[PDB]
Design a protein around this ligand. Structure first.
Ligand code: CLA
Ligand code: CLA
Ligand code: CLA
Ligand code: CLA
Ligand code: CLA
Ligand code: CLA
Ligand code: CLA
Ligand code: CLA
Ligand SMILES: CCCCCCCCCCCCCCCC(=O)OC[C@H](COP(=O)(O)OC[C@@H](O)CO)OC(=O)CCCCCCCCCCCCCCC
Ligand SMILES: CC1=C(/C=C/C(C)=C/C=CC(/C)=C/C=C/C=C(C)/C=C/C=C(C)/C=C/C2=C(C)CCCC2(C)C)C(C)(C)CCC1
Ligand code: SF4
Lengths: 741, 73, 143, 73, 219, 157
């Protein structure tokens, strides 16, 4: 009772005694490295704190310190980004010409002819073209000078040192107790208002006193070296008033509830800025202020040290109906004592959020000169899509882990979890049927179109000319959003994004955003996406639901979460554990995300990105998506074969690296096949023969070489498969977009 | 081109079948007492040397062929 | 002095809300298994078919499909609640056959009076060669 | 093909596919055939031409002879 | 270029022979399985004990060697076809200069000679090469389908089939129809055989379509 | 306080559950009144009804999607297509009956949800399936034939 700061003093001594004893955290790794399997086991269980100790307090302390270390690593990475943008970039020159100078923040040394990678980006600078979008972010923040980037890099280094010190201090000096970690009410109250709300309010303040004036002058047209410094605008209401007249009144309108006076810098316009092609910074300021107020208000719902507030346990236990028996009872105990359940929920929502971010960012470019940078747009979208997919797969994996280790039947009786586990057969069977139906009605349509096209019967295909499959619902929603301003949003001057419809927003002769028409090809690709997502969900859900027991193996929970099988009996139990379900879900997630990014790339290159010549829009691919994306042959020829000429012809130029990785990735992927179609027995016997050869020359090692375990073989195969495929797509996308963008 | 490719693929499949049936012979028709001391028993006595040298030759060829190709690339 | 205990049909079943992982149509045309145990208190346990049930205070009877499910439940009872149970095999015609505690003594404990079935008096490498038993529907381990 | 072995594509067999469309039927008509056919790629034309065969009657006789031989076997 | 490709061929032959010879010599038994001859020529495995025994029978060695044989034959046919493609067009310089690096093999041979093949049928029409384009995609599909049996193993499918059986036994109207044989997942060895068959069929069909379409559309 | 989900017939150890989708009064009545769940009706008549419905609903797809859908003679071609499909599913029914019913065995009894003993459905017999298959052929062919007539008649269409 009573939320407070409870901490234990000096729990772990600081020394290098355990650094010289690898495998000290695990009890099973104490007999020493008798075989090579010990080396792999040392790394496969380094972060599995649940196995290193049975105490939840120690596990929580380890997680907290690991989080601090991760924060320090991220800060080091950020510092490196800012330092490279301040010392090995053309940001200052790019500011004067953001439409012709290609951003670059990496310079290579001349050693073995690699200096060819230093492309002629522009502004008297040579380097590698970057697609992270840091230049646009810095411009939106009003960096302008390189000294500010250097200062930010130094500050990031200081923050990294602070994070590492915090982790060491919280693990060896002042370690929080278990009751401190279980304060979900206090944690939520602080993360909602003190973190998200306060951060949004602070960013809004910076945007008001730094981003708005500097960016306004830049857009109006003023040399970056002539714009006043940020402090000259943050501490001088006269100049800022010269740029925004509502500031001549100070803070009086805010406290008198006459907020309308602030309508000059707190607008609700919409669309994009015609000069930069991005969202109106005033709109973003207003958005951040509104969400900050909302988050601050939301950070006052849970009860802590006072009577006011709500109880998570009380709210959960009060939500029970006639179809769910007991209801949400027991969920609070699960989420307050199991780290894997929280990790699963957080990973799922985190990945979904990343995907939503990718969508909202290409639809509504939030940074200046970002939409016209096709390379940056495609790179950001694809990167966030992959991060989201990986996080979702991890969420499923941790859900299965919790179901295998932290599940307790005595605490989950007749509740949501128990009832779900009591009818897993119906869920899995229905999901399997919907997956089969989607696969048929989605892929068979493409196969039918291919067969008709090959048979000389284009009138029997599922296209916009023959049997039409118009997405009436999507088109209706799109038109509804287009007609929203002045009707279902009277205070809105334009739609959220030009994709809903309207005019074409072009910046510097290139189309920044334009309406995206949906046809039969869009209908087909959307159903393909739904089918792939459903199959991935089926695999992950099946693993989570059958991780404990199954009709084939009634004691699967006893075998653990990660085991290769249960022998060749019962016909075969290969890949029956939850870990194997995650292993297969990774492949399906890769397939789904790959199709998603391919669809996005082709659609933007055929119906969005292009040039304006006062006579129309000349798209990159000429709009061949609407007439070729309805068949697999079109995707293979008009997209894979047609757009791959940029990466296979990059030798001898700056993009040659993309041509090398493109091949290297192809190798790694194929390499994975060796570990995916093979078994452990063959390699063990081959190693036996090689060991005999070594013994014949008295060069056999004491650490008996052993073939990788079945689980390790599967992990290596899946890791190499995804690395090769993702890297191949990365090289192809980057080379193509950097050569035609 | 079609004839050359057809015959080469047929040859590859037939070679795999030849070795597969050789293995079948070793696991189903080989009698150590009837072949005690002949060429079969002796070649089976030093199978480790054979497999080891085959692995070494494969490793050498792969390492150098791939290295030269990657260097040229 | 041990005799197979008869299966009582008056034994109540544990408190369970029902699930889709129970008996199917195989039990109606082939066979099913029954596990009966004695509990000193009403307590929650995990069923092999998914979900959680509550074993009553006294005799408990549970019908499952495969024998492995019954043995898994028995293992859970022995290693968690220190409860001993009996497994029987029931056929559609109505025949009950005693199973697991065959002679009242667990198999892991020697009882002196069992059948030493399938116990070769040779080494694993002392089996007949496959070529010496060719054209005979038997493996080298059955000689 | 015997008269012009370098300007005529050998025909393997005819094509009778109810799923074919008009463009497919017109596109598969090549070596002066009445309808859609498949261009030979096995080289039987060159082999039969080199061993002395010249007319269709000889090919038919050989096919009948092989048919009788198969029945005999 | 001929030197490098010949050494690649030597590699394929040596590795394929190594796999086949290792499987034939270790068929009777090895240190991991001293009594392998007692289990026959083909068997799923020996269980997860002793560290794991996946793909330990001689049949599995032949299975792994088929992939290498296909790769070696593919390299041989690729070399022959590219060299003759340059010779027939009176341009030996293309192969003499682009065969020394892999990018030349992928760009000047695979991507360059696949334009007419993938254009057999398009949103504009079709020609006599449409059959080869369809066979090309057909081979790719069969190969990818085999990848499923090769990567996914028996365990996931057994549970899935059990769920499907429960669904059928509980669906009205359909209950009137019963199966004569209990549906079960494919065997481990059977799955390996099916995956290998799909892989080989897709490989052969894809190369046959590409070869015939490339050398037929030009000559 | 009500629990709409209960175990099948109160037994919680059977792989089935009673939900408002399976044990709903109206749903149960409609499902029980289908020709397939008529233990007391002759299998031939039930097969005739099933075949009539299936044959009638099977013309439409080929009518509006067949290769000759853009031709005035699409109705006739589709009527023939449905007849062919009915004949195919007819041989399917015959093969299933010949394989399923070929032996006899002392099967377990059958009771209702209340516990009232009822005889096994005559349809699940060698002669029962044959009569049902024969009725399905007559009904299936008649349904396809009626599908063509409806196209010619039906003032709206
Ligand atoms: C010089 C300072 C110092 C020293 C002497 C120690 C010493 C010790 N720590 Mg400690 N720790 C420190 C700082 C320090 N720590 C900091 C700054 C943090 C916050 C992150 C932690 C958090 C922490 C935790 C949570 C735990 C320990 C534990 C331990 C004890 C054994 C574990 C160990 O060190 O193995 C050796 C560790 C290493 C040799 C390095 C670890 C790997 C690093 C962090 C990876 C960095 C990533 C890097 C960028 C590479 C990734 C990318 C790459 C592929 C390119 C040991 C006595 C463990 C313990 O008490 O045992 C029960 C325990 O669980 N420490
Ligand atoms: C307003 C109060 C506040 C704030 C701002 C934060 C902020 C944060 N918490 Mg925290 N937390 C709080 C209260 C707060 N917490 C309370 C009251 C509890 C007890 C119930 C916890 C328990 C808790 C746990 C268990 C964990 C966190 C974690 C985190 C970090 C998540 C990483 C991230 O995505 O954010 C973005 C990252 C940044 C913005 C980096 C900038 C960091 C600055 C310096 C913010 C530091 C705020 C800090 C509370 C200041 C007081 C420390 C002071 C004594 C020096 C984040 C920086 C997680 C973590 O990663 O551990 C570090 C985690 O594991 N918190
Ligand atoms: C955290 C975000 C943030 C921050 C740091 C600032 C900071 C500042 N604003 Mg500002 N502002 C913000 C958000 C923010 N604003 C938002 C969201 C809006 C939209 C409504 C405005 C609209 C606005 C206007 C119209 C004006 C300012 C002005 C100013 C400057 C003087 C005002 C002041 O009170 O001094 C500093 C404020 C603080 C130190 C906050 C401390 C909190 C309390 C009051 C003190 C500590 C608690 C106390 C002990 C109890 C100052 C540097 C004025 C100016 O001079 O223009 C340049 C001006 O006219 N702001
Ligand atoms: C916040 C994210 C997060 C966190 C904290 C964890 C934490 C944990 N996970 Mg998990 N996981 C996640 C996300 C996360 N995971 C995601 C997104 C996935 C989907 C891929 C998974 C899938 C997963 C599985 C299948 C398993 C875990 C397991 C575990 C536990 C042990 C991890 C370990 O020590 O293994 C060792 C860690 C390593 C060996 C690091 C290796 C890094 C990879 C292999 C290399 C990748 C290359 C990289 C991209 C750079 C390429 C360049 C290269 C050429 C140099 C641990 C508690 C294991 C467990 O048993 O749970 C209890 C388990 O088997 N996770
Ligand atoms: C291109 C290769 C390929 C193909 C075709 C499939 C196909 C399928 N996978 Mg699979 N998978 C693959 C690769 C492939 N996979 C690989 C490499 C892996 C390893 C990671 C997996 C792992 C995997 C898992 C773990 C699962 C699947 C599942 C499925 C099934 C989903 C149901 C469906 O899609 O509905 C319809 C089927 C299709 C669209 C396939 C094409 C069929 C065509 C369109 C119909 C043609 C009709 C035919 C020509 C007419 C008969 C002609 C006559 C001569 C016979 C499906 C049949 C899931 C499943 O079991 O189903 C729920 C499942 O869980 N796959
Ligand atoms: C003169 C040639 C010859 C002969 C007489 C035999 C004879 C024999 N072989 Mg053998 N084999 C051969 C060549 C030959 N083989 C070759 C060339 C290979 C390399 C591929 C093999 C590899 C091989 C293996 C691995 C095995 C045998 C086995 C056997 C024995 C049993 C065969 C069996 O079970 O039949 C069954 C026949 C089949 C199952 C047919 C296979 C189905 C094919 C592969 C699918 C084809 C699909 C088609 C191409 C699809 C068209 C595509 C289109 C749809 C688009 C038997 C005595 C088995 C044995 O000895 O048991 C211990 C054994 O395991 N053979
Ligand atoms: C492109 C895919 C691929 C590749 C590269 C290989 C490669 C190899 N296979 Mg394999 N194989 C494959 C696919 C592949 N296979 C498939 C799909 C199957 C069917 C399942 C098989 C089945 C198979 C069997 C059954 C056997 C092999 C064997 C071998 C090895 C033969 C020795 C050799 O050639 O020396 C050359 C070595 C190489 C070409 C590897 C490259 C070396 C790297 C690039 C150097 C490292 C540099 C750098 C530091 C990389 C580290 C970076 C990292 C730290 C981030 C070799 C390593 C045989 C063997 O083990 O030989 C003894 C063996 O018995 N393979
Ligand atoms: C290998 C032999 C083969 C043959 C000879 C055919 C022949 C035919 N197919 Mg078929 N098909 C085949 C294999 C074959 N198919 C395979 C393997 C597949 C799976 C990939 C398909 C999938 C397929 C589809 C999806 C369709 C066809 C269709 C057709 C019909 C072409 C359209 C037409 O003529 O109008 C109509 C045909 C008729 C009017 C004559 C058929 C009715 C006869 C007279 C039955 C007489 C019974 C009588 C009522 C009593 C035609 C009869 C199309 C069709 O129309 O369906 C029938 C069509 O939709 N086929
Ligand atoms: C296209 C829509 C995208 C979602 C995919 C829908 C397919 C999923 C179908 C699976 C249903 C499984 C039934 C579970 C059965 C089940 O959960 O038990 C019944 C469930 C339990 O409620 P209780 O009375 O127990 O409530 C107490 C709760 O607090 C405890 O759970 O109540 C429901 O009816 C949930 C609604 C399920 C139906 C969801 C459909 C919602 C419609 C959304 C339409 C969106 C588009 C139209 C908007 C205009
Ligand atoms: C005349 C002449 C010459 C000479 C030559 C020579 C003398 C050589 C050779 C050759 C050779 C020498 C070849 C070969 C090949 C081989 C192979 C290809 C192999 C094989 C084998 C196998 C396959 C095996 C099988 C088996 C097994 C494994 C088991 C048991 C036994 C058996 C047998 C069953 C020259 C050219 C110089 C010049 C010109 C003239
Ligand atoms: S093949 Fe490998 S994974 Fe499959 S049952 Fe045998 S040992 Fe287990």
């Amino acid at each position: 009772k009573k939320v407070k700061i409870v901490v234990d003093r000096n729990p772990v001594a600081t020394n290098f005694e355990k650094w010289a004893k690898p495998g000290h955290f695990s009890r099973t790794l104490s007999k020493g490295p008798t075989t090579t399997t010990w080396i792999w086991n040392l790394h496969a269980d380094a972060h599995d704190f649940d196995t290193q100790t049975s105490d939840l307090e120690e596990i929580s302390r380890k997680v907290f310190s690991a989080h601090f270390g991760q924060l320090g690593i991220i800060f080091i990475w950020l510092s490196g980004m800012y330092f490279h943008g301040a010392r090995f970039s053309n940001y200052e020159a790019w500011l004067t010409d953001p439409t012709h100078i290609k951003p670059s923040a990496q310079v290579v040394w001349p050693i073995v002819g690699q200096e060819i990678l230093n492309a002629d980006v522009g502004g008297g600078f040579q380097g590698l073209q970057i697609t992270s979008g840091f230049f646009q972010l810095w411009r939106a923040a009003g960096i302008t000078s390189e000294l500010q980037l250097y200062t930010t890099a130094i500050g990031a280094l200081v923050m990294a040192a602070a994070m590492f010190f915090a982790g060491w201090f919280h693990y060896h000096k002042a370690a929080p107790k278990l009751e401190w970690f279980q304060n979900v009410e206090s944690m939520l109250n602080h993360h909602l208002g003190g973190l998200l709300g306060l951060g949004s309010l602070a960013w809004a303040g910076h945007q008001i006193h730094v981003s708005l004036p500097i960016n306004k002058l830049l857009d109006a047209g003023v040399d970056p070296k002539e714009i006043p410094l940020p402090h000259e605008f943050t501490l001088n209401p006269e100049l800022m008033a010269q740029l925004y007249p509502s500031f001549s009144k100070g803070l009086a309108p805010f406290f008198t509830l006459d907020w309308a006076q602030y309508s000059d810098f707190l607008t609700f316009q919409g669309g994009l800025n015609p000069v930069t092609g991005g969202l109106w910074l005033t709109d973003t300021v207003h958005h951040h202020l509104a969400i900050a107020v909302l988050f601050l208000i939301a950070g006052h719902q849970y009860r802590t040290n006072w009577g006011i507030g709500s109880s998570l346990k009380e709210i959960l236990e009060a939500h029970k109906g006639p179809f769910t028996g007991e209801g949400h009872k027991g969920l609070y105990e699960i989420l307050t004592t199991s780290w894997h359940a929280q990790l699963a929920i957080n990973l799922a929502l985190f990945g979904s959020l990343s995907i939503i971010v990718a969508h909202h960012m290409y639809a509504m470019p939030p940074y200046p000169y970002l939409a016209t940078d096709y390379g940056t747009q495609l790179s950001l979208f694809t990167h966030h899509m992959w991060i989201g997919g990986f996080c979702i797969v991890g969420a499923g994996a941790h859900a299965a882990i919790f179901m295998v280790r932290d599940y307790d039947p005595t605490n989950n009786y007749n509740n949501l979890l128990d009832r779900v586990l009591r009818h897993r057969d119906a869920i899995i069977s229905h999901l399997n049927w919907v997956c089969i139906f989607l696969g048929f009605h989605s892929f068979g349509l493409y196969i039918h179109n291919d067969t008709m096209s090959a048979l000389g019967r284009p009138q029997d295909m599922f296209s916009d000319t023959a049997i039409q499959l118009q997405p009436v619902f999507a088109q209706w929603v799109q038109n509804t959003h287009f007609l929203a301003p002045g009707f279902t949003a009277p205070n809105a001057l334009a739609s959220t994004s030009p994709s809903w419809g309207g005019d074409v927003v072009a910046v510097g002769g290139k189309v920044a955003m334009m309406p995206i028409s949906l046809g039969t090809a869009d209908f087909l690709v959307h159903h393909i996406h739904a089918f792939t997502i459903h199959v991935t969900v089926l695999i992950l859900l099946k693993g989570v639901l059958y991780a404990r027991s199954s009709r084939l193996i009634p004691d699967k929970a006893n075998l653990g979460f990660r085991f290769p099988c249960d022998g060749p009996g019962r016909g075969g139990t290969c890949q029956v554990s939850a870990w194997d379900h995650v292993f297969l879900g990774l492949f399906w997630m890769y397939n789904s995300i790959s199709i998603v990014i391919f669809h996005f790339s082709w659609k933007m290159q055929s119906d969005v990105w292009g040039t304006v010549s006062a006579n129309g829009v000349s798209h990159i691919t000429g709009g061949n998506f609407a007439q070729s994306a309805n068949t697999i042959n079109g995707w293979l020829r008009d997209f894979l074969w047609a757009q791959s000429s940029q990466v296979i012809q990059s030798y001898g130029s700056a993009l040659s690296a993309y041509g090398l990785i493109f091949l290297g990735a192809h190798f790694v992927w194929a390499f994975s096949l060796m570990f995916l179609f093979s078994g452990r027995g063959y390699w063990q016997e081959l190693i036996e023969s090689i060991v005999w050869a070594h013994n014949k020359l008295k060069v056999a090692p004491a650490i008996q070489p052993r073939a990788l375990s079945i689980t390790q073989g599967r992990a290596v195969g899946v890791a190499h498969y995804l690395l090769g495929g993702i890297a191949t797509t990365w090289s192809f996308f980057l080379a193509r977009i950097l050569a035609v963008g | 081109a079609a004839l050359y490719t057809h015959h080469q693929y047929i040859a590859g499949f037939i070679m795999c079948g030849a070795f597969a049936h050789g293995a079948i012979f070793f696991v189903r028709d080989y009698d150590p007492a009837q072949n005690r001391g002949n060429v079969l028993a002796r070649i089976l006595d030093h199978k480790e040397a054979l497999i080891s040298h085959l692995s070494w030759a494969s490793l050498f060829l792969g390492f150098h062929t791939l290295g030269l190709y990657v260097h040229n690339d | 002095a041990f005799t197979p205990p008869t299966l009582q049909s008056d034994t109540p079943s544990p408190i369970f809300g029902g699930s889709t992982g129970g008996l199917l149509s195989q039990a109606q045309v082939e066979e099913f298994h029954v596990i009966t145990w004695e509990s000193k208190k009403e307590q929650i346990f995990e069923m092999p078919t998914g979900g959680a049930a509550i074993m009553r205070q006294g005799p408990n009877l549970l019908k499952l499909a495969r024998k492995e499910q019954c043995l898994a439940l028995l293992t859970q009872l022995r290693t968690k609640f220190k409860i001993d149970g009996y497994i029987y095999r029931v056929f559609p015609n109505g025949e009950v056959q005693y199973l697991h505690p065959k002679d009242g003594v667990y198999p892991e404990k020697v009882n002196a009076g069992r059948s030493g079935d399938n116990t070769n008096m040779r080494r694993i490498g002392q089996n007949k060669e496959p070529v010496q038993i060719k054209f005979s529907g038997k493996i080298p381990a059955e000689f | 093909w015997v008269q012009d072995p370098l300007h005529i594509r050998p025909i393997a067999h005819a094509i009778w596919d109810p799923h074919f469309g008009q463009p497919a039927v017109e596109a598969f008509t090549r070596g002066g055939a009445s309808g859609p056919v498949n261009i030979s790629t096995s080289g039987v034309y060159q082999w039969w031409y080199t061993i002395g065969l010249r007319t269709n009657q000889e090919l038919y006789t050989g096919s009948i002879f092989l048919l009788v031989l198969a029945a005999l076997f | 270029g001929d030197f490098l490709v010949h050494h690649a061929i030597a590699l394929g032959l040596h590795t394929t022979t190594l796999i086949l010879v290792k499987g034939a010599l270790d068929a009777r038994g090895s240190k991991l399985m001293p009594d392998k001859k007692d289990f026959g020529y083909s068997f799923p495995c020996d269980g997860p004990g002793r560290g794991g025994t996946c793909d330990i029978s001689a049949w599995d060695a032949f299975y792994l060697a088929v992939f290498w044989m296909l790769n070696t034959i593919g390299w041989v046919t690729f070399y022959w076809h590219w060299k003759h493609l340059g010779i027939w067009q009176g341009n030996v310089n293309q192969f003499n200069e682009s065969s020394t690096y892999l990018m030349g093999w992928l760009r000047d041979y695979l991507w360059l000679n696949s334009s007419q093949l993938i254009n057999g049928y398009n949103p504009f029409g079709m020609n006599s090469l449409s059959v080869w384009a369809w066979m090309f995609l057909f081979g790719h599909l069969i190969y990818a389908t085999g990848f499923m049996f090769l990567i996914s193993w028996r365990g996931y499918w057994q549970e899935l089939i059990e769920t499907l059986a429960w669904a059928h036994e509980r669906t009205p109207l359909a209950n009137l129809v019963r199966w004569r044989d209990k549906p079960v997942a494919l065997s481990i060895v059977q799955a390996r055989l099916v995956g290998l068959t799909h892989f080989s069929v897709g490989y052969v069909l894809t190369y046959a379509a590409f070869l015939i379409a490339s050398t037929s559309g030009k000559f | 306080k009500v629990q709409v989900v209960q175990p099948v017939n109160g037994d919680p150890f059977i792989g089935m559950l009673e939900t408002p989708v399976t044990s709903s009064p109206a749903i149960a009545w409609y499902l029980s009144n289908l020709p397939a769940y008529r233990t007391g009706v002759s299998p031939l008549l039930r097969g005739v009804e099933i075949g009539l419905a299936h044959g009638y609903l099977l013309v439409g797809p080929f009518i509006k999607l067949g290769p000759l859908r853009d031709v005035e003679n699409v109705a006739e071609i589709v009527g023939c297509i449905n007849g062919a499909a009915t004949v195919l599913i007819l041989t399917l029914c015959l093969a299933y009956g010949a394989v399923t019913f070929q032996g006899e065995g002392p099967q377990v009894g059958v009771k209702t949800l209340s516990g009232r003993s009822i005889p096994r459905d005559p349809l699940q017999s060698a002669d029962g399936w044959n009569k049902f298959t024969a009725g399905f052929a007559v009904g299936g062919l008649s349904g396809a034939a009626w599908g063509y007539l409806c196209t010619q008649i039906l003032p709206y269409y």
